[PDB]
C-alpha cells in the first residue's frame, strides 16, 4: 500500500502537549502493526538548536547519525522505540539556507526566487523524503509530520502551504489533517467556550486546509452535547471530534485517544490495513507506572534546578530504570553551585538514595559537580556520571590522589594538570566501545561490545591515566583501538556503584525498553535504601 | 537638521510606475536644494538580481562600488544625477543571509531567531544605514525608501513592519509615508472607482501604517469632489491627496507632481528647509524632449525584440545623446539572429542611420551580432559596441584579416583562435580606470586622456592576438593604467567614420540632464550619415 501522511497542527495557545499528543497516536498506530516514522517542522530561523540555551528552550536531542535536533524528536523515539534520522527535524533556517545556496549556484535558471514555489517546494521535498525506504529497504506505512507553531503565524505560513500542496499531490485518500485546540474552562460562569476552536479551524480553512479530526485539549471531560456543537461549527465529523482531558501520566494519553476511537478513525479514513491494538507491551508499562512497590529518591546535580525540560531525556531514563525494578523514582533537582563546599553538598544530598551528574554543555560551574561526587563517595551513594559526569569523576579521582590543581582545559586553560583535554575534534552520534570483562559496566550491559550516542570534544588525557588509576578507578570502557576512554568505574570492593560514561545513554533509553546503565544505577540506589 | 525618511508603498496593481513616481519626487526635492539619496527594497529571495533572466525581469544595474542591483536604481541615479551605493538595494535574500550567518556565529546568544524582531531589525538597520554620512563627510537631508511589492503580501510584510518601527524610533516629524494607488475608469457607467484605493489604504492601516499622502494613478484627471471623498474615506489630509494623470513622457511627471503641490507638502510636513524649485536645468531637458529639430533611426541589435526593459539604460543613453543634438532617437529593435547572414542583416539594418551592439550577459547567439558589424562596416554605418559589442568588433576584425575560426572562449571553448578569453579568469565589477590614446576618436568624444567607466564581465581581449587584429586597421585606443587590459577599440576616420567599441557599460553613467560623451558622439555620427543621403 501507498505511504500515508498525517499532519498535526496546533492552534490558539502553545505548549498544549502537541508533541505528546502526536507521539501517543504514533504509539497506537505502531501497536496496530504499522511502520510509523515521525517528523517535526520547527518554524524558527535557527539551523541547529545547538546554539540555543538548553535552560530556556529545552534539551538538545542527538540522533544515531549525529544530528542536533529538538526535544520533540526524543518524545517520538521513546513512543515508537525506533531510531529516527537527522531529516526528522526541519527548520526555517535549514530551508532558507538550501534555497539561497541554490539561487547563488544558478539552480533556478534566471527566476525570481519567492516563498511560493521555491521555499514551499524545499519543505515539500523534506516531507516526501520521509516516505523513502529506510535501512534494510523498508518503506514506512504512515508519516506523522508535526507542523510547529500556532496556525496563523508568519513563520508557520510556508510549512502549512507545503502540507496543503502535499494533500493535492497525493489525494484525500493518502493525506490526513489533525488539529489540536484548547477548550478553556471559565471559573465565574462555570462553562467551557467553543470560540477558540471556532477561530482556530477558520484560520486553518482560510489558508486552504480542511481538518479531518479535532483534538480538544481540556482540564475536564468535554460533554457529548458540546462535542456535537463543535462538530457542526467546524464541519468536522462527530466521530473525528476527540475529547482529550488532562491525563495523570504521559503514558496514559495513548489509552485516552484509544477510548475516543481516534486510532480506528485514522485507519478507516486513510484506508490503512486494520488490525487490533496489541496492548501486551504498553499494559506492562502502565502497571509499572501506576502500581509501584518501592519509592527511591535520586538527586539530579544540574546547573539550573527545578526545570525538567533541560534534562528531559535524563529524567525519563531515570523513571525507565525504576520501572524495571517496579519502583517510583522521585527526582531531586539539586543546584550544582550549592555542592561546591562539603557542608553544602551534605545538606543537599543528605536525604537522597542516589546521585546523578548530567552532561553540562557550555556551562561554567564545574566545581559543584566535583564536590557532589566527593560527598557521594564518602557517604556511599551510587554515582552515575553522563558526558561531563565522567570528566568530573576523573577530576575528583585525580584530586583525591594528590593533584590539587587537576582540572579540565575547557574550564581552566591555564591548569598545570589537564586530566581532561582535546585530542580538537568534535564527536557526534553513535560511537563503538569495547568493554572490560567481569566489570560493573559489563555486568549491567551483559555484553563486551556496546554503542552509545556522543556530543562532546574534550576527552580523558592518556598521559594522566596512571596517576588517576592510583585512586582505584578503572577504565573499563574504551574505543575499539583503546585510545579514547569511554567508561570509568570503581571496583565493588572500593565502592558499590560509581560509574561514569563519556556518552549520553539517556537518548537510547525508552519506557518499554530501559537502558541497562540506568537499570543498574536505580537498582544500586534501592540497595542503598536498605539500612 | 536631522535626516528625514520618506517611504513609498504601492498597492492594488503592480508596474503602474512606482519607481518613476518616487524618482520624480526625488528630482523635485534635489531641485529645491536638498541632499537626496534613494533606496529600493525588493521582496525577492535573490541576494543579487544578477542571477535573473534580463529578458524576463529586467536589466541588472551596476553601481560605482560594483554591486548588481535592480533597474529601479537606474531610475533613481538618472533623476538625481548622483552615484548610489550598493546599500541602496536591499533584498529578502540579503537580510535572511546576514541573520542566519549571525545566528550560526552565535551573535544572537542562545535566542530563538524569528521574523520579529531579528529580520525586521536587519531591515531597520539597512534603512538607517543610508542616513550615515557619505564620502567627504556629507549626511543626506531626506532618504526616499521604496518598498517593492503590493501592500498585503507576506513577502513584503517584514519590510513594511521595519518602516513602522523606523516611524516609532525616530518620530512622526522625521518619518513620512506616501502610498501609490490606482483609480480605474469604468467605460459603461462613465465614473471612477474608489474601492481599489479604499481597500489598499485599509490593508496599510491594518498592518499599522497611517499614510501621510496618496498618489492617485489614473488615465484621466481626478476631480476635486472625488479627491475630497477619498481624503475623508482614507483619513488623509485633502492637501495630501495627489492626482497623477498619465503623462506623455517620463520627464513630465516631476512637473505634474509640482502642479499638485506634493513637493511643497512633503517639505511642510517633515519641517524641511523651504526653497523654490530651480527649473533652469529640467526646463532645458523638457524643451529637448518635446521640441526636436531632427529624427534619427538607430538599430539595437539585441537577442530579444521590442522589450525595452532588457536594455533600459542603453535606450535611455541613446535618447540622452539625441537631446544634446536636439533630435528625436527612434530605436529600431532588431533581433540579432536575423543578422547572421549578410542578406538578412542588410534587410534589417537597411533603413537605419546607426547600429548599436549591446552587452549580452549569459546569451548564446553571438554570430548574429558579428554579422551586424560586418554589414555596417560595408554600408558605412556608425557602430557603438558595449561590453560584448567590443568583443564582437574584435572577432569580426580578426575574421576579415583571415582568421576564419576566430571566436570568444565564452561561446566556443574548443576554438583554435580565442581572440576573447579570461585573464579561470577574474570578474570585473564597478568603476575601473582607463588611459586613452591622444587625438583618437574616443579622446575626441571624452575630451580627456583619462577616463573611468563601470564594468560587468569576466572575458577580456587576448594580448597575443593584438598584432593579428591590428592588421584590419583597428586600434586599441583605450587600455588599463598598466596597459595590460584592452578597454576601447576604434577604426581610424580615414578607414571608417565611427566604429567604436567599449569593454565597459557607459549607459549606466548616462543621465538625461548630463548625457554620456560616447553616446553623444555616436548619435552625432548617425546624424552625419543622414546628411550623406541628400
Ligand atoms: Ca521546544
Ligand atoms: Ca523589476
Residue numbers in the entry:
A (entry chain A): 7 to 429, 444 to 551
B (entry chain B): 7 to 429, 443 to 553
Paste lines from the article:
Indeed, another structure of the enzyme in the apo form at lower resolution (3.5 Å), revealed a homodimeric protein, each homodimer representing half of the functional tetramer and showing a dimerization surface of ∼1,350 Å2 per monomer, all in good agreement with previous structural studies (Endrizzi et al., 2004, 2005; Goto et al., 2004; Lauritsen et al., 2011).
